[PDB]
């Protein structure tokens, strides 16, 4: 959660979590230099993790 | 193959043939939206196409340029719009639209409205037959069902492209692209 | 919406009252206002008919079907459930009483056999309750004129007066005020017309109104005269013209 | 309702004369005269339930009383009470009762409450919890609202069993009026009379034939008929509507479904 | 529901005829007294169902004096008032049932 | 009902006025109280009246 | 909803399934017409003219069930065929059982009873076709019985079916009031067909060729389909309007 | 300028039907007053978007020469009151001066709510703007001289209140253009732009049955792309034949065939 | 039925029984169809019944009506 699941699904909903989530996806996705950066992700369940 | 052929009708051909468009008088394509599954190379296409059209390629994301507060940033975005139109010809690639889509009734009247409105303005101004040919617009989004309802009214994005599932042919070619990097094993 | 237990008819409902059975009643209400009044010397049943399409023939829509020549039925509800139920009533009765006891049923027995059919379309899962609730009005020798209601549940009750359909509320109270069993039949027919006339006032013409009596025998309509001992038909259905006569007596 | 007041007066009420009388005695008169009630010594008449399905002019009755009271009229709807922040609803109950005290005498009128008042509820939805709380506080405030200059809560419903009957009940609501919508001859006759007054009619056909032919027709059906009738009257340049024109206008509008549209598929 | 800390519980019945006599008596005294003192009769004859019921009887009996433009009640009025209040309570509460059992 | 009045009196008035008497003569102190019975009895009224 | 699917009583107590069948029987858009002449029963249906890949003639909506009895079908074709079997079949069985030709009225009653059984069957989905039987009946003479997908059935003086049914009905209604009877005028079997052809053209507003219609005619002891060219003999006077 | 009443096709019929409703009570409330009926105000239009409900509102306004205020409310849409509060007050004031006047309230549904009871709480805030407008235009007062025509495009965002009598008197259908109403439209479009002479539309209109007029403009433009691709500045009848097929696919797929309540 | 009478010969028991059993079906027919059955209809139904048992059920009848 936070940079994990969207809270858009709710009735009033929220998208401060979509901002955080989005930013991370784009840094990973496409060209962008890296200095041998390993990416480790700890999720209790893959289900909760955004499918994106 | 198919999507490339389609994008090239919407984009490349009008760019060079712009005189012809003026004469006949019909609008030239006012932007293409690509949507459906990721991994289909929405990215990629736009880069190659822009280069052919020799038109400055901005890779851009409308909520990413909101830095901290939506006070100092709503205003930043009005500048970004201004900059991007100027120094044409150009193809501005605006990406993921989901955070500012907000089809809901609890759609923010905050500064999130301002980014969104200036999205409508960009597209409206391209209509005509001279403004469409210089300034070109690509847009990328994944879910297409969460958008603003004023976007499904009129022809705000003048062309809508759904990605199809890959074929056998499509898979076999993508593998070849990857395998070349590796040692060739027959 | 409701439970999966209450849609099922093999499953005890939480309440214990099926959703199903309750649907059957909602539909009864939606139909025509049909009534029955019991008299000393007769029973009158009367109802209005669906106007349907303009060019659809009204005559062929029959909401009173004779079960036997001496016992008729009236219903509120749907046509399809009515006809199928009706073939079953006659058929089960022949087997269990016209070959065994070689005679027409008592009204009570016929009413009993109609409940059982009903009951089985509610017991067996996956088979909806009959879409129709009856009045079975009739005449037999042993227990005289008789008046019944048979519920799509398969419970039945005798009454002094009952009415069913949308206008059930209205009608029942009117009958009370104006009439009691001890009064003669002739009075009730005029009364019943008036009662049904509250229901609808645009047309009350004898074409759209089906009115019948079960009363005295008609030895003419026995149809094999020269033998007198056999009871004639108890039931006599009154034509439109006959209705119109009865409208000027009101 | 006084800043700009309705044009509905007790005179502008046509039919329902019998229903209309009881409602004035209950509501309008505690406010104009406290003094009458004090001399005998009774507790003023309490709330008034208005039910009868829409077209029975429940709201219309209260439009009449709004002019004559010369004094506050607070007209609110059920929408206001149900959530506006997911928490606004409990607060919103309290404010109408307080606001009434300030500008007393006041008529409290709540148009919809059929959806606020339900026997059962669902606490699993978060938004619903506020619906539940509004219902319970209303019961509480009403007991603390007796013996006030404000009339005890007036509300309008489609039905009297939408409200809980054990809880909301006589002696909160000691007058509970059913309106005729099946309607009698007299009741019909008065509604036709509002129209008959409004513009002269050129007799060209029986007036009373039309009444009898209306099975139960409500006020709204009768207004609609005239509206068509007069659209034809413009073209002709007629300015007094033929009784023949009304007859044909009735013929083309055989409302309340009749037989021709209900009967067609309930067969 | 479950144990915790709730312990005392007080049960309130709807009134009996004795209790009904008491509630009815004291409101009538404050208002205008029932003449012929048949407020006792009214309670003996029937039970209401609530003390809310009883205050409704009080209001109506008094309203009957108002229609005549009198300011005092009698027994004749209570006998009308009771039948109206009490019967209305029954016709609103029974309608929900169809014809089961 | 006065049945009711004696039963409620014991429970609220004596431990509030003097906890010191109640405690000693009895054992413990009474807790919350739940009033149950139909609407329209005038339970609310009782609660106001003791206070 | 689950409430839509259950074959057993809906919460409304009036089936969703039944309303659905009613939707279906207007997918094909066949306007049909059936009237009763004096001694002749005329049934007309649009014969669609598809592409050459299909033959036009073969395409039909009028079918000969038995002697005298014809059937016009409105609503989808594969379900039409399913129904058709059962009706042809019973006419035969009745003749075996009872040693006389089945009357019209009795065949329609049988099929209403089968319709109702379908919603009692869980597996089965109710047939979503209109069966309108036309005949010169044994006793009653010209007869029209229209059967609904639900299983309601009712007789008719005249009828039309389709999405554009409404326009045709009006003409037929007013006609019958001026004529002051329920039969289309003229004893002659031939000119009643033409009065039907003409009234179809009027209502719909579209002139139809022989290609665009099919005309089935009931006489005493046969139901038979006219030639393509027979239709034309009528059509020609009418066609100049 | 008047939108040419000839260039409205397949809804010719609509224009004429309309003036009964509009022209007679707008010019003279006198006739309806003497006749004996309350004068009608509130007219609801409805058709699948791109049949030109807006276009028809304009057509009528020019004929009479009555003042015309077209306000889209989807251009100012917000939750709580802000910018909307300023506009609507201004807008009635202009309408009053230029009376007789027609307000074509376009996408009334935009600031339109849905009542809910357990829904999003925000939609009721949106609804309030619409109610403020209603009272300004007409209160208890009934004028024909200033009149309101309400046009909707989405029906499930449309306000249940605004359906009722007392806000509304006629519910006027605007249906699909005609079969060869669509042909009239097709031909007009191509006359405007360059063409070498095209007459393949007799075939083309048939495939493109069920089209909104908006959608016909789309096959004409794509045909035109095809011409420029061929290196011509003239649409050839071949190019047009190509376009109508592909455009017909999407059009029905994603089609609006709704008629709003 | 009222206008279909027959007189029976053969085994007496069978003649009464067959008339009673068949009687019902004819009565069923009448009401089902809202029409008086054909004389031939009775004839047909009668014939098949007997035929099955190859005549052990020994009713030989004059069918009139
Ligand atoms: N069509 C393609 N052929 C081969 N590799 C592909 C293709 N599309 C994407 N990939 C690979 O996947 C990587 C990530 O692309 P990504 O999943 O971000 O795709 P996208 O369609 O641009 O989506 P989004 O921006 O919504 O995440 C690329 O850098 C490329 O190596
Ligand atoms: N194992 C235990 N330890 C302590 N007291 C116990 C035990 N088992 C039973 N009790 C008895 O239960 C009495 C009341 O416990 P109390 O109700 O305060 O407890 P709890 O389980 O903390 O719950 P809650 O806060 O919901 O009331 C104690 O005073 C004592 O008599
Ligand atoms: N015994 C009484 N004496 C006086 N008035 C009474 C009596 N009982 C009830 N009433 C009247 O009935 C009104 C409503 O009853 P109240 O709301 O106090 O009931 P309750 O039984 O505590 O119900 P709830 O279920 O709403 O909590 C009181 O405000 C009062 O006017
Ligand atoms: N006394 C009457 N005279 C005329 N018409 C009436 C009368 N009373 C009610 N109506 C009709 O009832 C309809 C509803 O009135 P309204 O006050 O809007 O309330 P509701 O629908 O809530 O009962 C109107 O169409 C009105 O014409
Ligand atoms: N009747 C018509 N005649 C000509 N073109 C039409 C017609 N109907 C629709 N169109 C075209 O579609 C365009 C857009 O429809 P628009 O006026 O925005 O209507 P709506 O309010 O129904 O969405 C019109 O401006 C016009 O170009
Ligand atoms: Mg990407
Ligand atoms: Mg109301
Ligand atoms: Mg209480
Ligand atoms: Mg518009």
Q: Is E4 in the pocket of ligand 2 (CB under 6 A)?
A: yes
Token pair in block for residue G222: 């046969």
Per CB-CB distance under 8 Å, the chain D contacts of F45 are 143
Contact E20, E47 (CB under 8 A): yes
User: Alpha-carbon distance D32 to C14, whole Å?
Assistant: 54
Cβ contact H–A (≥3 pairs, < 8 Å): yes
C231 Cβ under 8 Å from any chain I Cβ: no
User: Alpha-carbon distance B15 to C116, whole Å?
Assistant: 83
Q: Which of C219, C215, C211 is nearest to C234 (CA)?
A: C215
Cα G222 to ligand 9 centroid, rounded to whole Å: 60
Contact B162, B35 (CB under 8 A): yes
Contact flag C52-D264 (C-beta cutoff 8 Å): yes
Chains touching A (at least 3 CB pairs under 8 A) are: B, H
Q: How was this structure determined?
A: cryo-EM
Contact E90, D74 (CB under 8 A): no
Instruction: Count other Cβ atoms within 10 Å, centred on residue I33.
Output: 16
- Which residue matches tokens 């997911």? D86
Q: Is E2 in the pocket of ligand 2 (CB under 6 A)?
A: no
User: Alpha-carbon distance C6 to H39, whole Å?
Assistant: 54
User: Distance (Å) from the C-alpha of residue E101 to the closest C-alpha of chain C?
Assistant: 10
Contact H97, H142 (CB under 8 A): no
Domains in chain G, start-ordered, CATH in brackets? 1-241 (3.60.20.10)
Ligand 5, closest atom to CA H106?
21
Contact flag B153-H123 (C-beta cutoff 8 Å): no
Contact flag A12-H119 (C-beta cutoff 8 Å): no
User: Which residues precede a break in chain C, with C-to-N distance above 2.5 Å?
Assistant: none
User: Alpha-carbon distance G50 to G43, whole Å?
Assistant: 22
Contact E43, E20 (CB under 8 A): yes
Percent helix, strand, coil in chain G (nearest 5)?
40, 20, 40
Token pair in block for residue A9: 């699904």
> What is the Cβ-side half-sphere exposure of residue C120, based on CA atoms within 13 angstroms?
6
CATH assignment of the domain containing C220: 3.60.20.10
E16 Cβ under 8 Å from any chain F Cβ: yes
G141 Cβ under 8 Å from any chain I Cβ: no
With 0-12 / 13-18 / 19 or more C-beta atoms within 10 angstroms meaning exposed / middle / buried, residue I4 is middle
Per CB-CB distance under 8 Å, the chain B contacts of A29 are 43
What are the distances in angstroms from CA H212 to CA H14, H15, H47, H173, H223?
Answer: 15, 17, 10, 15, 18
User: Which residues precede a break in chain H, with C-to-N distance above 2.5 Å?
Assistant: none
H85-92 — which CB contacts under 8 Å span 24+ positions?
Answer: H85/H129, H85/H132, H88/H129, H88/H132, H88/H133, H88/H136, H89/H136, H92/H136, H92/H137
User: Distance (Å) from the C-alpha of residue H94 to the closest C-alpha of chain D?
Assistant: 23
Per CB-CB distance under 8 Å, the chain A contacts of H121 are 12
Q: Which of B106, B114, D130, D128 is nearest to A8 (CA)?
A: B106
Token pair in block for residue H98: 């230029």
Phi-psi region of D71 (alpha: psi -120 to 50; beta: other; left: phi over 0): left
Phi, psi angle pair for G173, to nearest 5°: -65, -50
Q: Which of C102, G102, G140 is nearest to I44 (CA)?
A: G102
Cβ contact H–B (≥3 pairs, < 8 Å): yes
Contact C46, C175 (CB under 8 A): no
- Which residue matches tokens 């059929």? D114
Chains touching F (at least 3 CB pairs under 8 A) are: D, E
Which site among H117, H120, H126 would you substitute to test the A interface, given the most A Cβ atoms closer than 10 Å to its Cβ?
H120
F28 Cβ under 8 Å from any chain E Cβ: no
Q: Does the N-terminal peptide bond of residue D77 adopt cis geometry, omega within 30 degrees of 0?
A: no
Q: Is D59 in the pocket of ligand 4 (CB under 6 A)?
A: yes
G201, β-bridge pairs: none
DSSP C174: H
Please provide the distance, in angstroms rounded to a whole number, between the alpha carbons at the two ends of chain H: 31
Token pair in block for residue I46: 């009668």
What residues contact residue D171 under an 8 Å CB cut-off, 6+ apart? D46, E50, E52, E53, E55, E56, E59, E85, F40
User: Distance (Å) from the C-alpha of residue H9 to the closest C-alpha of chain B?
Assistant: 20
Token pair in block for residue D64: 């009449």
G70, β-bridge pairs: G64, G134
User: Alpha-carbon distance H66 to B76, whole Å?
Assistant: 44
Instruction: Count other Cβ atoms within 10 Å, centred on residue H211.
Output: 27
Token pair in block for residue G174: 């007013």
Cα D220 to ligand 4 centroid, rounded to whole Å: 6
- CB-nearest to D43 from E59, E72, E85 is E59
In 3-state terms, what secondary structure has residue H113? coil
Q: Across the beta sheet with G159-161, what order do the strands follow?
A: G159-161, G32-36, G41-45, G214-219, G222-225
Q: Which of G238, G219, G229, G232 is nearest to G43 (CA)?
A: G219
Q: Which of H113, H79, H100, H91 is nearest to H22 (CA)?
A: H100
| 3-state secondary structure labels for all residues of chain D | CCCCCCCCCCCCCCCCHHHHHHHHHHHHHHHHCCHHHHHHCCCCCCCEEEECCCCCCHHHHHHHHHHHHCCCCEEECHHHHCCCCCCCHHHHHHHHHHHHHHCCCCCEEECCCCCCCCCCCCCCCCCCHHHHHHHHHHHHHHHCCCCCCCCCCEEECCCCCCCCCCCCCCCCCCEEEECCCCCCHHHHHHHHHHHHHHCCEECCCCCCHHHHHCCCCCHHHHHHHHHHHHHHHHHHCCCCEEHHHHHHHHHHCCCCCCCCCCCCCCC
H229 Cβ under 8 Å from any chain B Cβ: yes
User: Alpha-carbon distance I30 to C223, whole Å?
Assistant: 14
With 0-12 / 13-18 / 19 or more C-beta atoms within 10 angstroms meaning exposed / middle / buried, residue G236 is exposed
The DSSP H or E segment spanning H103 is strand H101-106
User: Alpha-carbon distance C8 to C19, whole Å?
Assistant: 9
Please provide the distance, in angstroms rounded to a whole number, between the alpha carbons at the two ends of chain E: 33
Q: What is the DSSP string of E22-55?
A: HHHHHHHHHS-PPTTS-HHHHHHH---SSHHHHH
> How many residue contacts between C and G have a Cβ separation below 8 Å?
88
Per CB-CB distance under 8 Å, the chain B contacts of A32 are none
What are the distances in angstroms from CA H161 to CA A28, D79, D208?
Answer: 51, 12, 35
Widest CA span in chain B: 60
Please give the residue range of the domain that contains residue C226: 1-249
Pocket, ligand 5, Cβ cutoff 6 A: H 7-9, 11, 47, 49-55, 153, 177, 185, 213-214, 217
- CB-nearest to E53 from D43, D160, D171 is D171
H79 Cβ under 8 Å from any chain A Cβ: no
Q: Is D57 in the pocket of ligand 4 (CB under 6 A)?
A: yes
Query: Helices (H) and strands (E) in chain B — how many of each?
Result: 8, 5
The DSSP H or E segment spanning H253 is helix H237-253
User: Radius of gyration of chain H from Cα atoms?
Assistant: 21
The residue contributing the CA closest to ligand 5 atom 16 is: H52
What are the distances in angstroms from CA G47 to CA E81, G34, G211, H205?
Answer: 77, 15, 7, 23
User: Alpha-carbon distance C136 to G46, whole Å?
Assistant: 47
Is H53 annotated for ligand binding?
Answer: yes
Per CB-CB distance under 8 Å, the chain C contacts of D212 are 201
The DSSP H or E segment spanning F36 is strand F32-36
Resolution in A: 7.7
Q: Which residue of D has its CA nearest to G18?
A: D265
DSSP B99: G
Q: Is B174 in the pocket of ligand 1 (CB under 6 A)?
A: yes
Q: Which residue of D has its CA nearest to E89?
A: D170
User: Alpha-carbon distance G123 to G82, whole Å?
Assistant: 16
H225, β-bridge pairs: none
Contact B53, B89 (CB under 8 A): yes
What are the distances in angstroms from CA B163 to CA B31, B38, B40, B158, H254?
Answer: 16, 9, 7, 17, 16
User: Distance (Å) from the C-alpha of residue H120 to the closest C-alpha of chain A?
Assistant: 6
Contact flag G6-C19 (C-beta cutoff 8 Å): no
User: Alpha-carbon distance G174 to G155, whole Å?
Assistant: 19
What are the distances in angstroms from CA G56 to CA G60, G214, H81?
Answer: 8, 11, 64
Contact C110, C116 (CB under 8 A): no
Which site among H17, H117, H126, H168 would you substitute to test the D interface, given the most D Cβ atoms closer than 10 Å to its Cβ?
H117
User: Alpha-carbon distance G190 to G237, whole Å?
Assistant: 14
H116 Cβ under 8 Å from any chain B Cβ: no
Token pair in block for residue A28: 């990973």
What residues contact residue C68 under an 8 Å CB cut-off, 6+ apart? C90, C93, C104, C105, C110
User: Alpha-carbon distance H217 to H219, whole Å?
Assistant: 6
> What is the Cβ-side half-sphere exposure of residue H62, based on CA atoms within 13 angstroms?
12
I63 Cβ under 8 Å from any chain G Cβ: no
Phi, psi angle pair for G130, to nearest 5°: -105, 130
Q: Which residue of E has its CA nearest to D178?
A: E92
Cβ contact H–D (≥3 pairs, < 8 Å): yes
User: Alpha-carbon distance G190 to G217, whole Å?
Assistant: 9
Please list, residue by residue across H30-44, b when 16 or more beta carbons sit within 10 angstroms of its beta carbon and e when fewer do.
Answer: ebbebbbbebbbbbb
Q: Which residue of I has its CA nearest to G105?
A: I33
Phi, psi angle pair for C120, to nearest 5°: -75, -15
Contact flag A12-H120 (C-beta cutoff 8 Å): yes
With 0-12 / 13-18 / 19 or more C-beta atoms within 10 angstroms meaning exposed / middle / buried, residue G57 is exposed
Is D58 annotated for ligand binding?
Answer: yes
What are the distances in angstroms from CA C187 to CA C41, C178, C238, F41?
Answer: 11, 10, 16, 51
> What is the dihedral angle through the alpha carbons of E19, E21, E25, E26, rounded to the nearest 10 degrees?
0
Contact C149, C162 (CB under 8 A): yes
Residues with CB under 5 A from ligand 9 (ion): H 54, 106
With 0-12 / 13-18 / 19 or more C-beta atoms within 10 angstroms meaning exposed / middle / buried, residue B156 is buried
Per CB-CB distance under 8 Å, the chain E contacts of F31 are 5-8
Contact flag I41-G103 (C-beta cutoff 8 Å): no
User: Alpha-carbon distance G233 to H156, whole Å?
Assistant: 54
Which residue from B44, B93, B95, B162 has its CB within 8 A of the most atoms of ligand 1, so it is best to mutate? B44
| Degrees, nearest 5: CA angle C172-C174-C178 | 125
Query: Total structural domains in chain C?
Result: 1
């Amino acid at each position: 959660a936070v940079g994990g699941a969207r809270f858009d699904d709710g009735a009033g909903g929220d998208n401060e979590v979509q901002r955080t989530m989005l930013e991370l996806i784009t840094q990973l996705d496409g060209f962008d230099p890296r200095g041998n950066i390993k990416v480790m992700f700890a999720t209790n369940r893959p289900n909760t993790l955004d499918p994106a | 193959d198919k999507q490339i052929e389609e994008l090239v009708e919407a984009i490349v051909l009008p760019m060079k043939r712009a005189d012809k468009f003026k004469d006949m008088g019909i609008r030239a394509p006012k932007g293409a939206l690509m949507y459906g599954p990721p991994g289909t190379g929405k990215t990629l296409l736009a880069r190659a196409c822009a280069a052919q059209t020799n038109a400055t390629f901005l890779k851009l994301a409308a909520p990413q340029l909101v830095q901290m507060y939506i006070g100092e940033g709503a205003k930043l975005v009005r500048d970004a719009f201004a900059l991007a139109k100027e120094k044409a010809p150009t193809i501005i690639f605006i990406d993921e639209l989901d955070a500012i889509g907000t089809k809901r009734f609890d759609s923010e009247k905050s500064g999130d409205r301002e980014v969104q409105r200036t999205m409508l303005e960009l597209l409206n101004q391209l209509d005509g037959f001279s403004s469409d040919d210089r300034v070109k617009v690509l847009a990328a989004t994944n879910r297409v069902d969460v958008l603003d309802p004023a976007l499904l009214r009129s022809g705000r994005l003048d062309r809508k492209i759904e990605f199809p599932l890959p074929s056998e042919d499509s898979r076999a070619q993508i593998l070849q692209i990857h395998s070349r990097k590796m040692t060739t094993d027959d | 919406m409701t439970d999966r237990y209450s849609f099922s008819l093999t499953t005890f409902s939480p309440s214990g009252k099926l959703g199903q059975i309750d649907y059957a009643l909602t539909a009864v209400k939606q139909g025509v206002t049909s009534l029955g009044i019991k008299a000393t010397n007769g029973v009158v049943i009367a109802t209005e008919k669906k106007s349907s399409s303009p060019l659809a023939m009204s005559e062929t829509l029959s909401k009173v079907s004779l079960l036997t020549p001496d016992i008729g039925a009236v219903y509120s509800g749907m046509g399809p459930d009515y006809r199928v139920l009706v073939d079953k009533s006659r058929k089960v009765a022949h087997t269990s009483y016209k070959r065994i006891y070689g005679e027409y049923p008592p009204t009570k027995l016929l009413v009993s056999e109609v409940a059982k059919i009903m009951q089985e379309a509610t017991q067996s899962g996956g088979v909806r309750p009959f879409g129709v609730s009856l009045l079975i009005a009739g005449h037999d020798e042993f227990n005289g004129f008789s008046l019944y209601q048979v519920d799509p549940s398969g419970s039945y009750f005798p009454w002094k007066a009952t009415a069913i359909g949308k206008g059930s509320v209205a009608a029942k109270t009117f009958l009370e005020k104006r009439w009691n069993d001890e009064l003669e039949l002739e009075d009730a027919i005029h009364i019943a017309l008036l009662t049904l006339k509250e229901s609808v006032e645009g047309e009350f013409n004898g074409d759209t109104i089906e009115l019948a009596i079960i009363g005295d025998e008609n030895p003419d309509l026995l149809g094999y005269t020269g033998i007198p001992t056999d009871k004639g038909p108890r039931f006599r259905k009154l034509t439109s013209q006959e209705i119109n006569d009865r409208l000027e007596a009101l | 309702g006084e800043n700009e007041k309705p044009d509905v007066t007790y005179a502008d009420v046509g039919g329902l004369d019998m229903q209309k009388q009881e409602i004035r005695e209950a509501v309008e008169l505690p406010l104009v005269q406290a003094d009458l009630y004090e001399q005998i010594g009774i507790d003023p008449p309490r709330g008034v339930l208005l039910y009868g399905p829409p077209g029975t002019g429940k709201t219309m009755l209260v439009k009449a009383v709004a002019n004559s009271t010369k004094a506050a009229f607070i007209r609110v709807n059920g929408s206001e009470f149900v959530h506006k922040y997911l928490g606004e609803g409990p607060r919103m109950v309290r404010d109408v009762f307080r606001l009434a005290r300030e500008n007393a005498p006041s008529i409290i009128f709540i148009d919809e409450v059929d959806s606020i008042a339900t026997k059962r509820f669902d606490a699993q939805t978060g938004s619903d919890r506020e619906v539940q709380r509004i219902l319970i506080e209303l019961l509480t405030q009403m007991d603390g609202f007796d013996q006030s200059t404000n009339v005890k809560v007036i509300m309008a419903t489609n039905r009297a069993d939408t409200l809980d009957p054990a809880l909301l009940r006589p002696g909160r609501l000691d007058r509970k009026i059913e309106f005729p919508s099946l309607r009698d001859r007299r009741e019909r006759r008065l509604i036709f009379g509002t129209i008959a007054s409004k513009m002269s009619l050129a007799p060209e056909a029986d007036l009373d034939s039309l009444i009898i032919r209306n099975d139960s027709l409500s006020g709204a059906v009768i207004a609609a008929i005239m509206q068509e009738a007069g659209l034809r009257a413009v073209r002709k340049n007629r300015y007094v509507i033929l009784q023949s024109d009304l007859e044909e206008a009735y013929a083309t509008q055989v409302k309340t479904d009749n037989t021709v549209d209900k009967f067609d598929f309930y067969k | 529901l479950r144990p915790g800390r709730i312990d005392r519980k007080i049960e309130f019945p709807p009134p009996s005829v004795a209790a009904r006599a008491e509630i009815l008596r004291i409101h009538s005294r404050k208002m205008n007294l029932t003449r012929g003192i048949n407020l006792r009769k009214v309670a003996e004859k029937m039970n209401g169902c609530s003390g809310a019921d009883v205050k409704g009887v009080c209001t109506e009996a008094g309203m009957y004096a108002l229609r005549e433009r009198r300011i005092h009640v009698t027994q004749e009025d209570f006998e009308l008032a009771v039948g109206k209040v009490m019967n209305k309570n029954q016709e609103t509460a029974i309608s929900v049932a169809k014809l089961f059992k | 009902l006065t049945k009711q009045i004696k039963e409620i009196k014991e429970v609220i008035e004596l431990p509030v006025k003097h906890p010191e008497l109640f405690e000693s003569l009895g054992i413990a102190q009474p807790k919350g109280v739940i009033l149950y019975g139909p609407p329209g009895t005038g339970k609310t009224l009782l609660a106001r009246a003791v206070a | 909803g689950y409430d839509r699917h259950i074959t057993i009583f809906s919460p409304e107590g009036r089936l969703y399934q039944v309303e659905y069948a009613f939707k279906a029987t207007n997918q094909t858009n066949i306007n049909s017409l059936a009237v009763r002449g004096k001694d002749c029963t005329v049934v007309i249906s649009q014969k669609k003219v598809p592409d050459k890949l299909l033959d036009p003639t073969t395409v039909s909506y009028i079918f000969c069930i038995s002697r005298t009895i014809g059937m016009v079908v409105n609503g989808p074709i594969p379900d039409a065929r399913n129904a058709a079997l059962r009706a042809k079949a019973e006419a035969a069985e009745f003749r075996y059982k009872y040693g006389y030709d089945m009357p019209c009225d009795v065949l329609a009653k049988r099929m209403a009873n089968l319709s109702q059984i379908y919603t009692q069957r869980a597996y089965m989905r109710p047939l979503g076709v209109i069966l309108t039987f036309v005949s010169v009946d044994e006793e009653l003479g010209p007869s029209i019985y229209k059967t609904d997908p639900a299983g309601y059935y009712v007789g008719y003086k005249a009828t039309a079916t389709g999405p554009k049914q409404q326009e045709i009905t009006t003409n037929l209604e007013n006609h019958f009031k001026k004529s002051k009877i329920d039969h289309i005028n003229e004893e002659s079997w031939e000119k009643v067909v033409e009065f039907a052809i003409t009234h179809m053209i009027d209502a719909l507003g579209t002139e139809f060729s022989k290609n665009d219609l099919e005309v089935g005619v009931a006489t005493k002891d046969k139901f038979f389909t006219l030639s393509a060219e027979n239709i034309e003999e009528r059509l020609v006077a009418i066609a100049e309007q | 300028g008047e939108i040419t009443f000839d260039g409205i096709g397949g809804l010719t019929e609509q224009i004429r039907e309309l003036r009964e409703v509009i022209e007679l009570p707008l010019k003279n409330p006198e006739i309806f007053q003497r006749v004996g009926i309350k004068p009608p105000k509130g007219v609801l239009l409805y058709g699948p978007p791109g049949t030109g409900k807006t276009l028809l509102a304009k057509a009528v306004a020019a004929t009479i020469g009555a003042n015309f205020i077209f306000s889209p409310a989807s251009g100012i849409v917000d939750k709580y009151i802000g910018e909307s509060a300023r506009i609507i007050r201004e807008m009635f004031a202009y309408a009053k001066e230029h009376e007789p006047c027609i307000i074509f309230m376009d996408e009334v549904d935009a600031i339109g709510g849905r009542r809910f009871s357990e829904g999003t709480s925000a939609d009721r805030e949106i609804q309030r703007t619409l109610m403020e407008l209603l009272t300004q235009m007409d209160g208890f007062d009934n004028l024909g001289q200033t009149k309101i025509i309400m046009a909707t495009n989405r029906p499930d965002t449309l306000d249940p209140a605004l359906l009722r009598p007392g806000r509304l008197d006629r519910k006027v259908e605007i249906p699909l253009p005609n079969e060869a109403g669509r042909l009239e439209i097709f031909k007009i479009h191509t006359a405007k732009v360059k063409k070498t002479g095209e007459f393949d539309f007799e075939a083309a209109v048939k495939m493109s049955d069920g089209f909104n007029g908006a959608d016909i403009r789309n096959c004409a433009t794509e045909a035109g792309f095809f011409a420029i691709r061929d290196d011509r500045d003239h649409i050839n009848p071949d190019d047009l034949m190509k376009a109508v097929r592909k455009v017909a696919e999407v059009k029905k797929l994603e089609g609006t065939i709704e008629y709003q309540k | 039925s009222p206008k279909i009478w027959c007189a029976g010969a053969g085994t007496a028991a069978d003649t009464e029984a067959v008339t009673q059993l068949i009687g019902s079906n004819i009565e069923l027919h009448s009401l089902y169809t809202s029409r008086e059955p054909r004389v031939v209809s009775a004839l047909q139904m009668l014939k098949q019944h007997l035929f099955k048992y190859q005549g052990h059920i020994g009713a030989y009848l004059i069918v009139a009506g």
